[PDB]
């Protein structure tokens, strides 16, 4: 759904979906070719 979100202080609007990106256990965020945030890790479940 199109929702507002606040992820550990990161504020924005968008549609959240299940990710197929392979983050390392260390990595918490993803960005595309233009340094726009396009992925987060849920702070409670650690879901990407």
Partner 1 sequence: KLIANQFNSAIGKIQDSLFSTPSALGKLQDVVNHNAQALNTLVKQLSS
Q: Least distance in Å: CB of 46 to partner 1?
A: 27
Residues that bind partner 1 (CB under 8 A): 33-36
Q: Quick one: 25 or 32, whose CB is closer to partner 1?
A: 32
Q: Least distance in Å: CB of 1 to partner 1?
A: 25
Q: How many Cβ atoms sit within 10 Å of the Cβ of residue 16?
A: 14
Q: What token pair was written down for 7?
A: 């992820």
Q: Quick one: 27 or 37, whose CB is closer to partner 1?
A: 37
């Amino acid at each position: 759904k199109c929702v507002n979100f606040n992820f550990n202080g990161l504020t924005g609007t968008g549609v959240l979906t299940k990710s197929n990106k392979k983050f390392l256990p260390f990595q918490q965020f993803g960005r595309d070719i233009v340094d726009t945030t396009d992925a987060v890790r849920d702070p409670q479940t650690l879901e990407i």
